[PDB]
Design a protein around this motif. Sequence first.
Motif, PDB file in Angstrom:
ATOM      1  N   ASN A   1       9.820   2.037   8.270  1.00 18.65           N
ATOM      2  CA  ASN A   1       9.948   2.662   7.220  1.00 18.65           C
ATOM      3  C   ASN A   1      10.469   1.811   5.906  1.00 18.65           C
ATOM      4  OD1 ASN A   1       9.277   5.497   7.726  1.00 18.65           O
ATOM      5  ND2 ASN A   1      11.291   5.685   8.606  1.00 18.65           N
TER       6      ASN A   1
ATOM      7  N   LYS B   1       4.470   7.812   9.735  1.00 16.50           N
ATOM      8  CA  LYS B   1       5.948   7.031   9.469  1.00 16.50           C
ATOM      9  C   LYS B   1       5.833   6.096   8.440  1.00 16.50           C
ATOM     10  CE  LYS B   1       9.518   4.950  12.075  1.00 16.50           C
ATOM     11  NZ  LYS B   1       9.760   4.371  13.141  1.00 16.50           N
TER      12      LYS B   1
ATOM     13  N   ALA C   1       3.567   6.278   5.936  1.00 16.34           N
ATOM     14  CA  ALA C   1       3.236   6.690   4.456  1.00 16.34           C
ATOM     15  C   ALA C   1       4.485   6.592   3.819  1.00 16.34           C
ATOM     16  CB  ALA C   1       2.703   7.929   4.533  1.00 16.34           C
ATOM     17  N   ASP C   2       4.396   6.692   2.504  1.00 16.82           N
ATOM     18  CA  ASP C   2       5.506   6.702   1.405  1.00 16.82           C
ATOM     19  C   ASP C   2       6.060   8.203   1.544  1.00 16.82           C
ATOM     20  OD1 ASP C   2       3.574   4.789   0.106  1.00 16.82           O
ATOM     21  OD2 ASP C   2       5.431   4.695  -1.170  1.00 16.82           O
TER      22      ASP C   2
ATOM     23  N   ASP D   1       8.500  13.220   6.424  1.00 13.54           N
ATOM     24  CA  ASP D   1       9.657  13.294   5.415  1.00 13.54           C
ATOM     25  C   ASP D   1       9.674  14.870   5.054  1.00 13.54           C
ATOM     26  OD1 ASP D   1       9.828  10.669   5.549  1.00 13.54           O
ATOM     27  OD2 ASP D   1       8.883  10.415   3.665  1.00 13.54           O
TER      28      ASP D   1
HETATM   29 NA    NA Z   1       9.273   7.865   5.363  1.00 15.20          NA
END
Ligand code: NA
Lengths: 261, 984
Positions: free
Chosen positions: B239, B686, B688-689, B707
């Motif tokens: 991350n 995972k 990705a922003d 998220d």
């Molecule tokens: Na994340």
Amino acid sequence: LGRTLSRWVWISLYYVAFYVVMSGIFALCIYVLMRTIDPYTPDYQDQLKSPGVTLRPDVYGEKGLDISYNVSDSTTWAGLAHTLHRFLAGYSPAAQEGSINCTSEKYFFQESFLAPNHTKFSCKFTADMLQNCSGRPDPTFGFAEGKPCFIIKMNRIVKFLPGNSTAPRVDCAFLDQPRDGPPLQVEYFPANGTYSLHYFPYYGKKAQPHYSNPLVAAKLLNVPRNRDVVIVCKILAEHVSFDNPHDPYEGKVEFKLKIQK
Amino acid sequence: INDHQLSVAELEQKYQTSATKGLSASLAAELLLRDGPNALRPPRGTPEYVKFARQLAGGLQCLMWVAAAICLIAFAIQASEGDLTTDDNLYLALALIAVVVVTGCFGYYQEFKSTNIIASFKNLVPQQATVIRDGDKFQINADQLVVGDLVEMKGGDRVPADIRILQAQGCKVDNSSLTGESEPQTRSPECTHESPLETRNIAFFSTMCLEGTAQGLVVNTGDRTIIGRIASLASGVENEKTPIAIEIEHFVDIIAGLAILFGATFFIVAMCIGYTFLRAMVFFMAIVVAYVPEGLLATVTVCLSLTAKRLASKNCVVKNLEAVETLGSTSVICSDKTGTLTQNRMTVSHLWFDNHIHSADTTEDQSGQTFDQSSETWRALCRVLTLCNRAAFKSGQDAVPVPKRIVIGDASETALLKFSELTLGNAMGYRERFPKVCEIPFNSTNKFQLSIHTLEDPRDPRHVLVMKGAPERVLERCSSILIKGQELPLDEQWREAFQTAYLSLGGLGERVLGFCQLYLSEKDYPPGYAFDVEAMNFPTSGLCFAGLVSMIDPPRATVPDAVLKCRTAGIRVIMVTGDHPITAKAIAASVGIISEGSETVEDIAARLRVPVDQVNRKDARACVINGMQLKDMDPSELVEALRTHPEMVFARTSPQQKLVIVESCQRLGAIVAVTGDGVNDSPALKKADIGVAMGIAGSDAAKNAADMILLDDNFASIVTGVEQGRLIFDNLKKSIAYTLTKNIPELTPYLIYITVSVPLPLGCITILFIELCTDIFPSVSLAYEKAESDIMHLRPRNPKRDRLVNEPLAAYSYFQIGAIQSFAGFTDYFTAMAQEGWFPLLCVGLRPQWENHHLQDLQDSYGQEWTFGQRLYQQYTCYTVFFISIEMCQIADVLIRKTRRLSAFQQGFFRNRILVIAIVFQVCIGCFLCYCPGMPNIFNFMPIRFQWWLVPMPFSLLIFVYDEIRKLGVRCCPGSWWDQELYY
Ligand code: NA
Ligand SMILES: CCCCCCCC/C=C\CCCCCCCC(=O)OC[C@H](COP(=O)(O)OCC[N+](C)(C)C)OC(=O)CCCCCCC/C=C/CCCCCCCC
Ligand SMILES: Cc1nc(Nc2ccc(F)cc2)nc(N2CCc3ccccc3[C@H]2C)c1C
Ligand SMILES: *[C@@H]1O[C@H](CO)[C@@H](O)[C@H](O)[C@H]1NC(C)=O
Ligand SMILES: *[C@@H]1O[C@H](CO)[C@@H](O)[C@H](O)[C@H]1NC(C)=O
Ligand SMILES: *[C@@H]1O[C@H](CO)[C@@H](O)[C@H](O)[C@H]1NC(C)=O
Ligand SMILES: [Mg+2]
């Protein structure tokens, strides 16, 4: 850098102009403030609800006033004697010419400025009124014999009246051990150790440039030697209060004394 | 790859197993010991204290920790000299520490609550399996499977291992989680494809046998499974920092730079004046600390929590506070298809009858446009597909919505029964009434389903024959057809139209299914006579065709409008899927990923009848890229293709390829959001922003990697998320400006005190009360402000040029509003000093005498003599009056911070009720702090006179007027020097 020269100079000029305008506004506000206040009387006496009391000579030890000296060695009290002479130099007849004799024995009120240079009359206090503790004929101020003289001075407040019932008095006594041992005996100068009523009220530095605080000298006659004692001197007056834990000097003065033999 | 390609004989010698007898029990036990359990290894290295420590760390947190350390070191230096009044260093240090700790506790609580809310969907299953050993079939646990075990499969099984099918008879499994294929796929021993995923002779771990029976060998177990390797790849992903964290770090850098500059310049000033070097160092540390706000972090966390609560009201669960802003700054949305943009359930999509293609409603809530249903041809076709279907509903459901209602049978059978129950009302009871005297199910030879039914009418018992099958096989069995509600013979034109309709409906990826009926009169077949399946007495030809029904996995109801809104918000939408390009392109066209009038290179080549070599690529706006074409490509070509085509769809993409697409988009310098529901999306989720996982349809890996989670599975929640993100960006910068502006008023008195030696105008306890108590509420209430412009029309912010806090904001807040507030406070301070007896000129240089405990008869401007205690009470009065000046100026400051560009009259003074309550609360707390008995003893606050309340009011009005004029000038001249320099 991040901006061209023209942009930097333009923003600098803008900030200079902004700060100049702010400075002018602040200066105008302070000028208006100075124009409204009275030059003779404070507007809002708030923390001056009761005069403070100070002592001469003043040696402050670690935290509070603590006077100690060797009776056999004169060097120990030489500094205190010099302090007393230096303080009493101001209360000399050469330094009291501007003031005038004053035996009104009551509140010396002044609604008008009838003194030179548009001032008010100030009643004179001279060191000779302390008699024994004035420095003559004893330059030691009683320190040589173990009988020190201490000058108690009440802080002046503009248009403050202590009380018409009786001239304000000073009372010195032991604090730690009053009941133990004989009570402290003190001889006062002037008689009864009272501040004469014609020294009040104070009208300010502008109205009374030659004003002189009245003085009372207390001479201690029975102080045990080689023993540490604490002496408190309070002001007995109707409008002078000395019950303030957060200001120990308000209306009274407390000091440690140790006369080594 | 060698697992599937190898045939039976060499696999026997390779795995030391028999295709019939099975693996030896001792061999199975030793291999189980050697390889380990079949269960995937779950990572569990996440202690609670580690998470708490992470919540205690971060840009503002490290700045505050360093500020506390500086306070402690300065106190140590002052203790080295034996100085007095050093308890303020501890006051500030513990204030910073307590703020950091309480903020970390709040954030940890939010994360823990979100994790608990998400965890309700987890559900363990023992997952028993059927295996042959010693010739006796029995059951074991899922993990007990070992490589080479001969294992049986039946409908409804979870396929507890990767298994190469050796025998299969009509086995269909779903791979919508591991792969992106919505349509059930057949498993047959025959093998021709190189890819293990596309290969038809192998099954997969996290799958389900929809129908059929089979038996095969175990090729992989544990973390060597396809799901296991996907999970390992997701674990390999690391991350990165969220955009809001980057903004905070940039802001902390700005703060540190300004603090260092001011501290160094005033340290040189302290040298020039004549202060001791250690004293100047202490002053340096004091200025550095004074530039560090401590109540800012609390306000940021509260604003983030409020936005998270607004999102959670709409079933958007964020696992961290910082994720509520990322969608607002997102520039690229990489979207999964099967299960994310689609419902993952096969349903009826089109009906071709009467030479007309009608569209049915495919929304899960039945809120779409319906088709014409006033035709007797429609009634005939309805009876045809109702009587042909054999699927049945689960018992106990009458209030359950029909599309969500549980049905047992084939996917096509389920879709047909659901379509009947939608068009009709009680087709379940309708099927029972008609007797099934002859029923022929789907056969490898017949390739159809046949049913003979008796009519409901007692007068007319004529037999009705209904058949359902593949169109290429059904059409050859027909002679007449229902047209306009009449029986019409088949000509060449009808066959041509049938072929065109079939080809068109197959070009959308929808499976086409043909239906026909015939009437058997009682003269040919007596009513009492029973029809025999094997006798084949039926004509079985010359049938009357009814129509075609085409079925496809449809988009979710809210997906198209949400995609359109995201596109109008400047966010480019990329579709990535593991499905066939035909279905992917049809879905992209349906949901607005590919706009109308946008054609691909294949479409252009078809239109102009030209080979793709001469076809111009730039003419085509849409683009479809296969997985093989992606593999042939290289990063330079992939970047060029991304830049060239505004609309792009990726089909047949592996999890690694989705990960690479996300990596390329991120590396180009864009904030990427990834939406997913399956394990094949977890690596990209995972990476990705922000990763948004479907809640109801999502898997465990997708939810863990994501998220944000959509509990109601509403794709329309993404536009709410992006709106809230942009709004929180604007409101956060407003609140930061409001909090920052009051630093300079608190610091300037210390500079003046040190340099000019006036009595101290402001104390540390008053500063703590300003920072921690009075001004937290108004800055938080600033987060309820409405948008000045329309959020959706704007382009996504440039991460490089557009910062949360830039130089214009800091400069304005610190050195214009802060300067005015400092001037107001000093004006009020000098008013208080002069009205009590201390003229301004006397105050200059008075500090050494003011603070001397040995001076109990210090003279004021009038000659009155003061003790130390009375001077200290005057000092506390100055503290109080300067504090009141700051508060009065901050009341107007929050009003000016309401809007960045619009006038306060243009918006509402009272539309933000929380702001009004905050201002009232601030006034009340100030009044209580001033006029409460015993206050001067504990906190250095004194009951001040009303005149000193009014002294700073002209400066408050000046702040308001100056900001209003600035905003008016900005509005009037959008591209001028004033707008360029004076707009923040
Ligand atoms: Na994340
Ligand atoms: C980046 C640029 C920063 C610029 C900072 C400075 C801004 C301007 C401030 C001061 C510069 C000028 C100094 C004088 C200012 C007041 C002018 C004024 O009119 O004064 C009048 C009084 C004298 O009385 P009079 O002769 O009128 O009486 C006549 C009647 N009779 C004679 C009977 C008594 O002179 C006085 O008291 C002087 C008292 C001075 C007190 C010390 C300064 C305290 C100021 C603090 C403000 C700080 C602002 C910081 C801004 C933000 C920075 C980030
Ligand atoms: C009276 C006094 N004393 C100190 N002492 C000190 C503190 C830290 C240090 F590293 C060295 C000395 N700091 C003071 N300010 C300066 C004014 C200010 C404004 C906002 C936040 C904090 C402060 C502290 C920082 C004051 C007003
Ligand atoms: C004070 O000083 C004299 C000078 O010699 C000395 O004799 C005497 O002992 C001192 N006092 C005490 C208590 O030691
Ligand atoms: C003031 O004091 C004396 C005594 O009261 C008075 O008689 C005389 O006029 C004045 N003398 C001097 C030296 O001022
Ligand atoms: C003060 O001095 C006088 C002489 O003028 C003398 O008679 C008297 O005893 C002295 N009193 C004290 C306490 O020293
Ligand atoms: Mg999916």
